[PDB]
Amino acid sequence: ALRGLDTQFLQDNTALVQAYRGLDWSDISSLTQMVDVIEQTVVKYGNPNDSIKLALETILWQILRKYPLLFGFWKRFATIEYQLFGLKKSIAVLATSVKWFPTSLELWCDYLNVLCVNNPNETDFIRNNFEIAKDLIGKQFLSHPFWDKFIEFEVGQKNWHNVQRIYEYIIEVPLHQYARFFTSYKKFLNEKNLKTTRNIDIVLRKTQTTVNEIWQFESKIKQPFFNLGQVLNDDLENWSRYLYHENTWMMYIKWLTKKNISDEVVVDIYQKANTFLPLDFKTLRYDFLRFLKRKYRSNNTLFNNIFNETVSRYLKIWPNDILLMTEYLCMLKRHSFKNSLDQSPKEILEKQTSFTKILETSITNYINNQIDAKVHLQTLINDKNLSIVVVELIKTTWLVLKNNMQTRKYFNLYQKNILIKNSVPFWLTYYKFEKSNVNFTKLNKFIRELGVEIYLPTTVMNDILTDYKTFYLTHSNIVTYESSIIDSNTFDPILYPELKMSNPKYDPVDWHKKTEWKEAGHIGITTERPQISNSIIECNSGTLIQKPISLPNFRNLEKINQVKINDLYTEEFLKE
Amino acid sequence: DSQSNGLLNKELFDKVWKRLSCKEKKSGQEILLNNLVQFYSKDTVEFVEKNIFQKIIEFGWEYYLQNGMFWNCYCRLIYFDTSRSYLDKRQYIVRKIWPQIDKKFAQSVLPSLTEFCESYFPEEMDTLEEMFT
Amino acid sequence: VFIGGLSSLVTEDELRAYFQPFGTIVYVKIPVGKCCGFVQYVDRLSAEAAIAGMQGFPIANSRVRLSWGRSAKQTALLQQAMLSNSLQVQQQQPGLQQPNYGYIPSSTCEASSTMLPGCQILNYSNPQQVIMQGSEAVVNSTNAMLNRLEQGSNGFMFA
């Protein structure tokens, strides 16, 4: 987050540690909690990781210092400070060092050795290889880094060629090819490396993102596909994530999609973006969920669990979102209740009946507020996403089971609930049902109530009125229209949808105390306007000549200069 | 059932089909199709299918055949029928309609067809994506 | 337009769906947890019609009281200025630089032309650029209406 705030918190922690003057186990616990809070509230940058590692080393905790460093290195490929601290800690280690440190060194070489800031990592790997007696492992590690592009690529190649005493020319042609490829890659990279060393730095800004350096790196990775892409992608992604950038994440994920790499790696990258990226972006997460939906076919077992976990997290962080609920219902009805046309209709109908039963039980229990943790649907359900579940129940009952009486019963029962009364999908499906049946009485009642009892968004009201006008004009006749006309309410299904087009509170069923008269010319400002009680401007002079005209009777004359304003904005927002 | 022949009378059907015969020059092809779909009864859907959708299928007009909203309209016309049983209509759709379309139109027909599949046929979605590889 | 009394169950998309058919919209915002939003129309006529028509209309079971307001930058400036209680000075919203001939206020567009007076020669893009209205706009409006009536019933959008 804020660098100044982090520095102030670190200074306060140091002051508290100094003022403790003792071992201060409570202060050590407070410092550990503060470090964890900083890591969880920030990107867990190299500076905080190094500060935490230094604090742990001062508290004589090598394992604790390595654990935050190991986490920050596995959570950031460009974590140079974390990698250096881990190497320093693992320099003096136990017998398991030969198995532990080599794996981390190999991971670091496969992840960020092709970066210009990988010189210390290569030096540490060379030192470990020289100290160890594993000649084959050392030669393999040297060969792995000899084919990678770095700033000191020539120096690294010369060092490898001079240290290779027992394997100087084991494969002379491969060695020459590797040396030439590394030299050419370094020469081509030098321009972008310098343009990044002059522009690439984490400062959380446009100059921090280094648009020119990023464009150069993207061009060198896309156009110059020298088969080193498998490592150049990670090398460019390190600097790209050194900047969060939604557009960069989309570019990178599309690039691996064009590579058509194995599914677990792209799933892991999607998860890493889901964690690192902050909330309220709503684009990469939906892209990931759609990717799971399309690639589900490949596995059919693991992707179901991943989808369920992701949907649970997304609906917990976005209480009001709805597309998550329909995606979860589609996934559940596709996976858990698997149907197919080959098998018997009697077996098929049982799955649909079980689906109706589980939806009914979940809805009834949530309405009565008895949540059952065993069923995932009930815990995943939400107060905004109830109308979608009930409308899906209606759709299944009406279309599959073909139980019209039960569908009408469900409509009557759940219409009156405040929780799903003013919802768009429920009333649109009711409209589709009362249109699948031709009956016009229910539809006329519905579009009459559309302004009084059923509060729907005005766009949906316009759509319903237009579509019902067209449907009536196409599927009714004059006899029905004349029978449906009643003049007591002045309701006619042909002109009324045209009149109520954009007025939500349009009703077909002393004019000086009303708000409309009080603020006629200006909206938002209510002023009493002076007027003559017995105004004769309506009468013609021909009938005015009949009798002497009475003197005027006045109204609201003291109120010509006092004007009142209901300053709702200032009252309810600024003063809150 | 006193199902009044709205657009299925020879006086108006002639004009509607004459406008549908232009197929690129006009603007309301999709609106006409979607407003012709809504009939919801055995004989009426039989007539609408045989006269409009089967005839266009046999004529093979590429513009309408590659427009996924046309296939959405056809599947929706069949699926909302109140005469067919659920198994009959699912069988009809999956084994008749989808095989009738060509595979070279996949990249254009897939969006609307998948939109219908996700809304009404979650079980048959696997069959759809398998057949459309 | 300053909309107050929101029920917190409504989001920016649903509020835009509520306040779209009265005119074109520059931006719609809902401050987090402040139970109020803003709708910045282009036409004064559209804003007046919205205030006159949507008054007491319950969004998410809570009645709504509409009144005039300010922008977001102006809101922040006013808040800092009353915290410092220094000046409390406002600036008038920019005008349309009359005369303008193409536009007809309170008009909607979604997606040759002889520039005759009857039609609408120019209009505003739906978010912003300026596009010349054509005769196919009425077809596109009905097409999108039917699309969102079919899909919105299945439940891909509450709008």
Swiss-Prot record, chain A:
UniProt record, GO biological process: mRNA 5'-splice site recognition; mRNA splicing, via spliceosome
InterPro entries recorded: HAT (IPR003107), TPR-like_helical_dom_sf (IPR011990)
Record key words, sorted: mRNA processing, mRNA splicing, Nucleus, Repeat
UniProt keyword Nucleus, yes or no: yes
Superkingdom of origin organism: Eukaryota
SMART domains per record: HAT (SM00386)
Gene3D superfamilies reported in the protein's UniProt record: Tetratricopeptide repeat domain
Localisation: Nucleus
Spans of repeat HAT: 51-83, 85-117, 121-156, 158-191, 216-243, 402-436
Keyword Nucleus (UniProt): yes
Alphabetical list of Pfam families matching this protein: HAT_PRP39_C, HAT_PRP39_N
Record's miscellaneous remark: Present with 4460 molecules/cell in log phase SD medium.
Family named by the database record: Belongs to the PRP39 family.
Entry function: Function prior to stable branch point recognition by the U1 snRNP particle to facilitate or stabilize the U1 snRNP/5'-splice site interaction. Has a direct role in the assembly or function of a catalytically active spliceosome.
Protein name: Pre-mRNA-processing factor 39
Organism: Saccharomyces cerevisiae (strain ATCC 204508 / S288c) (Baker's yeast)
Biological classification of the source: Eukaryota, Fungi, Dikarya, Ascomycota, Saccharomycotina
Name of the gene encoding the protein in the UniProt record: PRP39
From Swiss-Prot, chain B:
UniProt GO cellular component terms: commitment complex; nucleus; spliceosomal complex; U1 snRNP; U2-type prespliceosome
Swiss-Prot/TrEMBL keywords: mRNA processing, mRNA splicing, Nucleus, Repeat, Ribonucleoprotein, RNA-binding, Spliceosome
UniProt entry tagged with the keyword Repeat: yes
Keyword Repeat: yes
GO MF: RNA binding
GO biological process: mRNA 5'-splice site recognition; mRNA splicing, via spliceosome
Subcellular location: Nucleus
Domain of life: Eukaryota
Annotated HAT repeat ranges: 48-80
Additional free-text comment from the UniProt record: Present with 1730 molecules/cell in log phase SD medium.
Job description of the protein: Essential component of the U1 snRNP particle, which recognizes and binds the 5'-splice site of pre-mRNA. Together with other non-snRNP factors, U1 snRNP forms the spliceosomal commitment complex, that targets pre-mRNA to the splicing pathway. U1 snRNP is cotranscriptionally recruited to intron-containing genes. Required for U1 snRNP biogenesis.
Description of how the protein assembles with itself and partners: Component of the 18S U1 snRNP particle, a subcomplex of the spliceosome.
Name this protein carries in UniProt: U1 small nuclear ribonucleoprotein component PRP42
Source organism (scientific name): Saccharomyces cerevisiae (strain ATCC 204508 / S288c) (Baker's yeast)
Shown residues in whole-protein numbering: 409 to 541 of 544
Swiss-Prot record, chain C:
Tree of life domain: Eukaryota
Disruption phenotype: Affects the meiotic recombination and the formation of viable spores.
Limits of the RRM domain: 1-71
Cleavable signal peptide: none
Free-text note regarding domains: The RNA binding domains RRM2 and RRM3 are required for NAM8 meiotic function. Within the U1 snRNP complex, the RRM2 domain of NAM8 is positioned to bind to the intronic region immediately down-stream of nucleotide +13.
General function of this protein: Component of the U1 small nuclear ribonucleoprotein complex (U1 snRNP) involved in the initiation of meiotic recombination. Involved in the formation of DSBs at recombination hot-spots through meiosis-specific splicing of REC107 pre-mRNA. Collaborates with MER1 to promote splicing of essential meiotic mRNAs REC10, AMA1, MER3, HFM1, SPO22 and PCH2. NAM8 interacts with the pre-mRNA downstream of the 5' splice site, in a region of non-conserved sequence and is required for efficient splicing of uncapped RNA precursor.
Miscellaneous comment text of the record: Present with 1480 molecules/cell in log phase SD medium.
Subunit structure: Component of the U1 small nuclear ribonucleoprotein complex (U1 snRNP).
Record-given protein name: Protein NAM8
Source organism phylogeny: Eukaryota, Fungi, Dikarya, Ascomycota, Saccharomycotina
